[PDB]
Every structure is written in structure tokens, then in C-alpha cells.
Design a protein around this ligand. Structure first.
Ligand SMILES: CC[C@H](C)Nc1cc(Nc2ccnc(-c3cnn(S(=O)(=O)C4CC4)c3)n2)ncc1C(=O)NCCC(F)F
Ligand SMILES: [Cl-]
Length: 299
């Protein structure tokens, strides 16, 4: 093989009759996502799924590139494609993530989220990202909105619509080299990881809230960064600031971020100061044959 190794991932094609749409979970620019059940025929098994749609030939091109990428990933902190359905609109059949986006989760449970959870989410995102780096894959769109929540203890990265091998763009999560020069490395995803961590530690604040995106390039060139969240010690903020260095190679590698955040995760109250940290706790069908996608494996 002249460069990359051959990608022997199986694209599984699912019948429309195998799965039942239940309700609409979300709708927007990204598309239409539905809650559903997948019942693979023969097997006494029911699999909670999210079904993503979007109509146009350019749109089928974009979602099949996303399907390509999700089909080729297998890590506990990255979402995989279960299959595709080839109806009039191409559907992506994915794992149901019951607690939704991590951005929406931190906003809704601001009063119940402890330091242990926040730091473990940072570990898990770093592991997910390091895996994508091992697969030579630049996400190009890491943010709290694109991290989903399987359980409060277990998050995964998704939205591979911008994912590429090493009009509208998410300026406020992007490294300076990406805004100025369209340069995207694993180290530009590290910048976005920093902003993602900032979202989590502020319980889902909008980064640069009020600033228009055309002004952001000059702001970052001047040396301005996102402010230190109230709960963050200097230890945690220094790691965020390190992700936002001008020099890309000077930023942390994802493997180092796993290490540092997991050290901090063993003594969470030393690194995040939250009022009342200790008392905080977190969590129609025949459910007998229900199996989560992580337990439904294929030969
Ligand atoms: C916020 C994302 C969407 C609307 N919500 C869900 C998505 C999923 N599954 C998966 C699995 C892998 N990838 C995706 C994926 C890919 N791209 N995107 S995206 O929408 O473009 C992205 C937000 C911009 C989502 N989704 N599971 C559950 C929910 C949900 O709403 N749970 C709350 C109620 C419960 F009853 F379900
Ligand atoms: Cl790949």
C-alpha cells in the first residue's frame, strides 16, 4: 500500500422495516434526528437508536462522507455508525444517547454537576480525540454540542461532517491558523478541545458572548483569550491556556491531556472549586430484549 493502510470497515445496509421511528429528538441546520428502535430480524433483540436525515444530491454526498467516517471508528469515546438505510433520503442509524448533548446537559444540571464528573468528561474527550489522532483523523468541529452523553459517567464525540484525514465555519472553536490560513492539524483540534473544556467549566457559556466572528481573528492576534472560569484553579486554566498557544507544536498533545486530567481526576476538589460539591448525585415498550449498541457486536 503506497500511503494509508486499507480501510476494511463494514458498511451495514439496514432495511426500513427493521426499525421504528418513535419521535423527533431535534431539528436544525445539521438535519433532522429521530428517536427509534432497531429490531434486527431473526435475533430476539431491540436496539435504541438515533436516526439522522437531512433531499438534494450535494446533501447525500455530505452525509455519506459523514457515514464513511462514523463507519470506520471503533472506540468507547467516539460514536460509531450502526448502519445506513437507503430510502429516498439516506438515513444514518446511530446509537441512542439518552441524555443528549453534553452542552445541554451542563446547562440543565448546573446545580448538580461535581468536579469528578467535569474532570472525567475532560479525560474521556481527550481519549476520544487521541484515538482519532491514532486513526490520522482531524475532527475540525470539536465542541460541547458535538459531545453526546450515553450516561452521566460516559460521553462520546460525534458529528464527523467536517472530519478529514491529515460556507459557514465554527470560528469561536477554531485555532488561529485555521481562521487565517485554513490549516487544520490534530493540534488545531487541541485548540477546540480547550474551548470545549471552557464550555464545560462555565456550565455551557457561549464563548466570546456578544463578539461577532469577524472580530475574533484580531482579538486572538492581540493575545486575548477566554476568561478563567470561576470554578477553575490556575492548574486547570493553565492547561486551557496551553491549548490556545499561537505555536501549534507548543500546545499539549491529546495523550498528555489524558494524563494531566486523569491525575487531577484522582483529587478533583484540589483542581475545581464548586460550592456544595459532595452532596451532588446523578442517575413505552417491552424492555426485556433491549440491548444497547455497545453490547450489540457484529462478526
Ligand atoms: C444533540 C444531538 C441530537 C439532536 N440528539 C440525540 C442524538 C443521539 N444519537 C446520536 C449518536 C451519534 N451521533 C449523533 C449525531 C450526529 N450528528 N448529530 S447533530 O445532531 O448533527 C449534532 C448536535 C449537532 C448528532 N447522534 N441520541 C440521542 C439524542 C437526544 O436527543 N437525547 C435526548 C432525549 C432522549 F429521549 F433521546
Ligand atoms: Cl480512516
Amino acid at each position: 500500500s503506497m500511503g494509508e493502510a486499507p480501510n476494511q470497515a463494514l458498511l451495514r445496509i439496514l432495511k426500513e422495516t427493521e426499525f421504528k421511528k418513535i419521535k423527533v429528538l431535534g431539528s436544525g441546520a445539521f438535519g433532522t434526528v429521530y428517536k427509534g428502535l432497531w429490531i434486527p430480524e431473526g435475533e430476539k433483540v431491540k436496539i435504541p437508536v438515533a436516526i439522522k436525515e437531512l433531499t438534494s444530491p450535494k446533501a447525500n454526498k455530505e452525509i455519506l462522507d459523514e457515514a464513511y467516517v462514523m463507519a470506520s471508528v471503533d472506540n468507547p469515546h467516539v460514536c460509531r455508525l450502526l448502519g445506513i438505510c437507503l430510502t429516498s433520503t439516506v438515513q444514518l442509524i446511530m446509537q441512542l444517547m439518552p441524555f443528549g448533548s453534553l452542552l445541554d446537559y451542563v446547562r440543565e444540571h448546573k446545580d448538580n454537576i461535581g468536579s469528578q464528573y467535569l474532570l472525567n468528561w475532560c479525560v474521556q474527550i481527550a481519549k476520544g480525540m487521541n484515538y482519532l489522532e491514532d486513526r490520522r483523523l482531524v475532527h475540525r468541529d470539536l465542541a460541547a454540542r458535538n459531545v453526546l452523553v450515553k450516561t452521566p459517567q460516559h460521553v462520546k464525540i460525534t458529528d464527523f461532517g467536517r472530519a478529514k484525514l491529515l460556507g459557514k465555519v465554527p470560528i469561536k472553536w477554531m485555532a488561529l491558523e485555521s481562521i487565517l490560513h485554513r490549516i487544520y492539524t490534530h493540534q488545531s483540534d487541541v485548540w477546540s478541545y480547550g474551548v470545549t473544556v471552557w464550555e464545560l467549566m462555565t456550565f455551557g457559556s457561549k464563548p466570546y458572548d456578544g463578539i461577532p466572528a469577524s472580530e475574533i481573528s484580531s482579538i486572538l492576534e492581540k493575545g486575548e483569550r477566554l476568561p478563567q472560569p470561576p470554578i477553575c484553579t490556575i492548574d486547570v486554566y493553565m492547561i486551557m491556556v496551553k491549548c490556545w498557544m499561537i505555536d501549534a507544536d507548543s500546545r499539549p498533545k491529546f495523550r498528555e491531556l489524558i494524563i494531566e486530567f486523569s491525575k487531577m481526576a484522582r483529587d478533583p476538589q484540589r483542581y475545581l472549586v464548586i460550592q456544595g460539591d459532595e452532596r451532588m448525585h446523578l442517575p413505552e415498550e417491552d424492555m426485556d430484549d433491549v440491548v444497547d449498541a455497545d453490547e450489540y457486536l457484529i462478526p
